[PDB]
Design a protein around this ligand. Sequence first.
Ligand SMILES: CC(=O)N[C@H]1[C@H]([C@H](O)[C@H](O)CO)O[C@@](OC[C@H]2O[C@@H](O[C@H]3[C@H](O)[C@@H](O)[C@H](O)O[C@@H]3CO)[C@H](O)[C@@H](O)[C@H]2O)(C(=O)O)C[C@@H]1O
Ligand SMILES: CC(=O)N[C@H]1[C@H]([C@H](O)[C@H](O)CO)O[C@@](OC[C@H]2O[C@@H](O[C@H]3[C@H](O)[C@@H](O)[C@H](O)O[C@@H]3CO)[C@H](O)[C@@H](O)[C@H]2O)(C(=O)O)C[C@@H]1O
Ligand SMILES: CC(=O)N[C@H]1[C@H]([C@H](O)[C@H](O)CO)O[C@@](OC[C@H]2O[C@@H](O[C@H]3[C@H](O)[C@@H](O)[C@H](O)O[C@@H]3CO)[C@H](O)[C@@H](O)[C@H]2O)(C(=O)O)C[C@@H]1O
Lengths: 420, 420, 420, 170, 170, 170
Amino acid sequence: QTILPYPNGLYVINKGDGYMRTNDKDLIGTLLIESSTSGSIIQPRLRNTTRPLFNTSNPTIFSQEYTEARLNDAFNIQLFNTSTTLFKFVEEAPTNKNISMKVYNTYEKYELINYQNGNIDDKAEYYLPSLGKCEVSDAPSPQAPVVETPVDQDGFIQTGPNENIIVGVINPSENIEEISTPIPDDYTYNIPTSIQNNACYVLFKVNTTGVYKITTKNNLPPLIIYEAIGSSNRNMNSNNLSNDNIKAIKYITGLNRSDAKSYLIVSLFKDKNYYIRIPQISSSTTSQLIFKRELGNISDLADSTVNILDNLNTSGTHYYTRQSPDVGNYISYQLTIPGDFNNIASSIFSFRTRNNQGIGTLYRLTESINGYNLITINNYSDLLNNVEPISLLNGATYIFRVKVTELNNYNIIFDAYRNS
Amino acid sequence: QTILPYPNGLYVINKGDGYMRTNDKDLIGTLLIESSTSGSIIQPRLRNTTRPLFNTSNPTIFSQEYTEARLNDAFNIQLFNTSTTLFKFVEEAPTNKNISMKVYNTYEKYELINYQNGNIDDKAEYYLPSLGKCEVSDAPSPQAPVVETPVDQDGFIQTGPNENIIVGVINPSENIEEISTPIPDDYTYNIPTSIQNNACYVLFKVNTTGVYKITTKNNLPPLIIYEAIGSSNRNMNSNNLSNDNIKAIKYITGLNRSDAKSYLIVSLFKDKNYYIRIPQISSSTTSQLIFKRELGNISDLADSTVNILDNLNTSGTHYYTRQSPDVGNYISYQLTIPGDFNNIASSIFSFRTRNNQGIGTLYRLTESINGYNLITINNYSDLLNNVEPISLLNGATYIFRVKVTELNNYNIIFDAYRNS
Amino acid sequence: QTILPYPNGLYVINKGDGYMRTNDKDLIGTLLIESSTSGSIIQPRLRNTTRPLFNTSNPTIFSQEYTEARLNDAFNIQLFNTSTTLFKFVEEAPTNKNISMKVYNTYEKYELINYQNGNIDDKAEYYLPSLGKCEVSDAPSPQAPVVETPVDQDGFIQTGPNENIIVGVINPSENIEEISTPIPDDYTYNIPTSIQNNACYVLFKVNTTGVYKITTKNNLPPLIIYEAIGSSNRNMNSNNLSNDNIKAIKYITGLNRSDAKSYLIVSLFKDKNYYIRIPQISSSTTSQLIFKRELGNISDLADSTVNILDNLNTSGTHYYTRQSPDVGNYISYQLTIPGDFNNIASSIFSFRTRNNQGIGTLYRLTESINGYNLITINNYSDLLNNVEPISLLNGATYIFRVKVTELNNYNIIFDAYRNS
Amino acid sequence: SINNVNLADGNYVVNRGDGWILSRQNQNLGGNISNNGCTAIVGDLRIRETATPYYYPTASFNEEYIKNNVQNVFANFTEASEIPIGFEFSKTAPSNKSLYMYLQYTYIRYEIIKVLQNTVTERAVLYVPSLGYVKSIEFNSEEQIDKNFYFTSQDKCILNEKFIYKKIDD
Amino acid sequence: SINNVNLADGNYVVNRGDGWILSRQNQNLGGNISNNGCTAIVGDLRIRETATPYYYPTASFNEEYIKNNVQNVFANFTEASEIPIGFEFSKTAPSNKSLYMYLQYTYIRYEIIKVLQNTVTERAVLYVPSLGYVKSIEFNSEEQIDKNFYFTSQDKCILNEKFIYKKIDD
Amino acid sequence: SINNVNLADGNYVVNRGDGWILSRQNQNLGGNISNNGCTAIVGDLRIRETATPYYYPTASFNEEYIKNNVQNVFANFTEASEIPIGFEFSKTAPSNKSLYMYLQYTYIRYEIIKVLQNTVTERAVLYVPSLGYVKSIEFNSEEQIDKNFYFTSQDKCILNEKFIYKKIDD
Ligand SMILES: CC(=O)N[C@H]1[C@H]([C@H](O)[C@H](O)CO)O[C@@](OC[C@H]2O[C@@H](O[C@H]3[C@H](O)[C@@H](O)[C@H](O)O[C@@H]3CO)[C@H](O)[C@@H](O)[C@H]2O)(C(=O)O)C[C@@H]1O
Ligand SMILES: CC(=O)N[C@H]1[C@H]([C@H](O)[C@H](O)CO)O[C@@](OC[C@H]2O[C@@H](O[C@H]3[C@H](O)[C@@H](O)[C@H](O)O[C@@H]3CO)[C@H](O)[C@@H](O)[C@H]2O)(C(=O)O)C[C@@H]1O
Ligand SMILES: CC(=O)N[C@H]1[C@H]([C@H](O)[C@H](O)CO)O[C@@](OC[C@H]2O[C@@H](O[C@H]3[C@H](O)[C@@H](O)[C@H](O)O[C@@H]3CO)[C@H](O)[C@@H](O)[C@H]2O)(C(=O)O)C[C@@H]1O
């Protein structure tokens, strides 16, 4: 029941090892090891068969075979119901007492979820057969009074160390386009007409490491970008992108919200592969993907979605709801002050947020023949309760960077209050 | 060559583990383990085949298959010529000397015997394959002078700890009747006509724990009673005796001797099953088995055969030969003094024994409307040489309890000497 | 590139264990064993297949199957490409550091050679699969700078302890004759006519342990003698030589040189078997093998070839080239002084050698009716540079024994210099 | 006594715990003998083919009824049986004396009871092969041994007994 | 960076060393849990049928080209694959705490590089199954664990990386 | 010498003891090399298919005569041969030096002798595969090793030889 700061899509979550059912349904056996004696329990794999456990909320789509394919995409798991990995426990009893050795079968719990708009619409739990648990302790007295105890509720308990690793995977129902040649400093990709029928991903790599501005010609629709986990330093060709069919993807930045007019600014390394997810364009007029290397401190925004703000020519509150970045990550807003430019003319503004807390930085965006440049106008250590106003030059453009420090809600609301 | 205090029938005797043939016929091998080195010999069961050894004095009846069935009845042994049980020895040599590790195959010796009237008429020895013996010792000198030594006599030697466990089994050639309903305080069973052709056993359980008097209407023939070893606390039904097909039986008390007019008094627990062996009744007139719960100190005789004495109306010696109880167990004799009752009138008696020694207790049997009652008249700490006379009321009934303390002969002779 | 003091024939040389190819071509794997942890690598023989390595200089004659047959003759190796022998390594890391465990497959190197006149004309190297090598050491830093290193030259390196064991084998292309009856003190064997087509061996055993003089009637051709390694104390019959088909032979003494007129004097034990190799006699007149037990100190020459010297009736140098015995072994020369016997008459001689150094002993050969006898005339501690002359009685016979102390050349030259 | 349970009326399935050894089967598998500081090891593999369940049904509770009701709440021993599991025990013989150790299978005791007025009226029993247990004793050819060491006349649990139930419905 | 090699122009086969673990495959085999001084052991058998090679070919260097050129200079992993080899790791859990250890296969990284002006222009990659590696951590149901323990996002070598080459001819 | 037995005239079957190693077969199975405190283990399984008996018959005593007379008084090695038995040896290499150990099969030497006047006139020999024996030596690439370590030219017993007989009748 916690906020999950990720875009819509599929995720495979490794929820830990050591899971086993209640009522000793996974108990292999108990050994009474008398003092000055050694006991041992072994899983020798004289048979390589294992018995996975599966549970789904939608058997037609999230079938076991489907979930297994996801798990393969996420962690590259090869074998699901077989194993050649042996495990064995060995304990020696002290000279003074007897020992009880209990061994159980265990499972690693992988959760598959279909995450849509801060909500889980489908869910499957796959329990991968693991390498057991062994509990040793002082042997109980054969005379200990028998206590009538009610059986526990049917279910699983977690025995291993705490773990929660989220790995996102390419949505298998959305096609993958590829930009074969390592994109130079400037590049424009024409979005195929297939985009009219469903979202797609575009796989590519930059020829030169640096910061890039990526966007559509109208700053619409919004774009999401991922990194192909493990794609770095494998096969490589300076004049061709070598594919690895890596379906495990790390979310860099981006949004799903339709009206979110914006562009991305992210740091990209040439030794890696990336995926840009383009939403479905329900139009008939060709769209484009524009890549542009950026020199200068525009990198301050590195790995962030820059939301261009609309309807600023009024007084008072100016809200903007957007998917909140995770604690520690950015989300930017671009402001072109309403009115005409002539240094003197200005307008009073008050930057604030409503759901989530964060640290803000206000920049003055300046154009040059050596790229863009930012000038820090001020910093804010409390956005939720900021009341400090600031006067901005009319006709000028400002960028406000928010660094989430407290993730209370799925969405973060930015308020560019206008005092006048 | 020792006395075996048991009734006629079949017995399976576990005579111990560690048996192996002479002349190293069971030697698996020897390892020379040099100092600062470890040696190990293993029986990995890469093949589950074992080779039992068998010997019988009557191949037609006591065949190996027959003996195996007995062993199954006695100890419930499942596998005779196969095993999945691994055994292995490991030894590390000190830094100063070399070690010699000798490993041999071994066997557990089970002896099957047909015991009849203090005599063994048939005998079979079954050697169940065991888990080996390992002898480690200082390595001998490769130069030690070779001593011409004659081969030993063909045979077996005992290497394991001393053991001699006697387990009796239902005679497979005598039928088993069953008293389905837990017998109440009083019950009479009509002995089927099959008893005319061979002895039979009657399986039953008492509804209420307590002491019981069991007998035939004429106190003839004598009855023997056993407990079904392991029958306690398994399946159970308050209105039905659940059978376990347990053929392993523990001798409680009873005799085989034909003329032994008597009845039994034994302690019975409801959570157990029992067998009463009725000898063959070579008659044509229906016989009966009478069960009767007994309240009162008649329990002093608990687990004993009460022999009713005949021909007491004469002077002098009055002998009674009977199968002797084992050291520590009882054997009782009932005496109704010859003559008519009138307190005053009495007769002088001298109780003694001839073959085996024991401790005696003389009781006065009194009738009440609350069952029987016993009154201790005297105790004797030496029956073999007792000469102390005692006067008993004529027409009254006395019971004399003997507790064997010295088992010299198969039979114990009771002498109710009459001084007058 | 060293002198090999053996007669022509086949030899199998065990050149050691621990051989493995370069560039980790035999690397099985490496384990990183973290501190307070144990690592283990096993060759469990779940498959009994092994992969030998072979190399020959003459594939038509020294084929792998042929070499394997030789190896069998030499060491009796049974299995060449299979094994049921398990090997495993186990290492525990200290509490302070990590350990690196490297395991490699290894081979024992057996070299087969056709040795002819101090030269190897054919050669085969057979690499018998061995039981591995394990290298443990401090784990390297995952950050250690990567150093571009050129691959090594294709080949083998020796990892095991130094070893070089030469075992000669019966030349499989020369027939084996057998003297069925243990030869008495005197015996003459008629060399079959097959000797006209190729050399042969004669297998025999002496009835009585002692020293023997063996030779042909003309002291030509020269004879070589071997012992059948392992033939002692196995099957035996006092009236018959029990064959063992032992093809492994130990060179006692003898030469190949054609003109070498000589006879052998060697020590023979009855509990052993021997082989005398008779060269091919390219004649049509029957030859013979004469055995004669010798009593007396003629045994001083025990295990030596006695070369009868020719052309002594001149002055100056008198050279004799012969295959040199190995360091520590003998080679004798017999001298019958030119002229007629009459004590007084003598001739001055100077005994020397040229290639190899040694210790000499000069004997006076005397005839008796109790066999031969030797009288030491003098000893020499330096033959290479001996200049001490000695006068020998004309018409008398002397034997000069050389004990090699320095093996510089395949051949040793004896010089019986005549001062006059 | 043992039939007095504080439970509402009705049928129940009860896990009496792991660690049960059966009557007189003590030495069915064999014994091992060692001496002078040597280490003795004995083990096994409860492969389906071998170790098999022991049923003790009643009129109200038959073999099938027992199995299904047991494998429903507790471990499904039928599925498990197809996967070989091993166990071993090892002990070192004393300096200059002999050691003897023998092995026997352990089981899990399951019961199907009929409760009527806080007392068991009917009781079915099931023993599922679990693992194994070894008993050892030091000795010499003269010592007398308590026969209890070698023989167990009545089923018992080498661990603390248990009573974990669940009411059976339908 | 990683593409700068001081070698003459031409193709090469390079042994990048043993000890490589692959991305996010960390827990594919399972984990083991023990406590109170018990000894935990985990092992395997890279039988051909199971552990298989991972190829990452390029236009100039295809699967076959990579294999033959690798098995020529270095260990022939194809022949070796028919002979079962085993490996195990063991660790003792702490006095009164829990231990968790998991296993993952290790590989030998081989590369086929195209050098042109002292910089790698093309690079093919091959991972040959080698043996295995275990990672362990002590814990309790409350402790938070660094996720780096459980997850490896980028291929890496647990030993020192290597660069042993040989120019390819023909 | 070795043929002088103090026995009445007639034929005999003699157990010369376990622990015999054969001539020059020393290294037929291979050697193992380890170092720096590592533990080296080598073992085997004398499965019928492999380890086989060596016969050395005489005119009076042929293969069959030897076998039957041996398996009659002593261990029947033919029956035993169908049951796999294993053995292993382990040794720890020294602190900073190398260890080499090699394995060879051991046998039981049986003899069929013909006694006539207190001296053996005929002798048949049989070697029954028993178990194994390892020899180890510490070393370095420079050390010279006594070749007796690697080579055994004449059959011998690593334990004390024996002479346990029984006169053959019929
Ligand atoms: C100053 C100003 O006009 N700000 C308004 C703001 C912006 O105009 C837009 O964000 C564009 O920059 O729109 C606000 O909301 C009005 C719109 O709400 C949208 O809500 C959607 C949302 O887009 C989805 O992400 C969400 O999953 O579902 C929501 C619907 O429940 C509607 O889609 C859109 O049609 C408008 O109704 C805002 O909060 O951002 C209001 C600001 O005043
Ligand atoms: C006072 C008195 O009469 N006592 C005699 C005694 C009793 O009458 C009976 O014991 C009945 O209580 O009988 C004595 O012996 C005579 C009988 O001996 C029996 O011997 C059998 C015996 O029954 C078997 O157990 C045994 O296996 O075989 C014996 C035969 O060798 C006879 O069966 C029976 O016919 C009588 O001859 C006795 O010693 O008990 C003698 C007492 O004087
Ligand atoms: C005093 C004297 O005459 N000594 C000569 C010596 C002897 O006569 C012989 O050794 C007989 O005892 O012969 C010497 O050499 C001449 C002969 O050389 C031989 O050389 C062979 C040799 O036999 C082979 O072993 C070798 O492999 O090949 C050599 C040929 O290259 C010839 O075979 C033979 O015909 C003679 O030429 C000698 O050195 O022994 C010379 C002595 O002066």
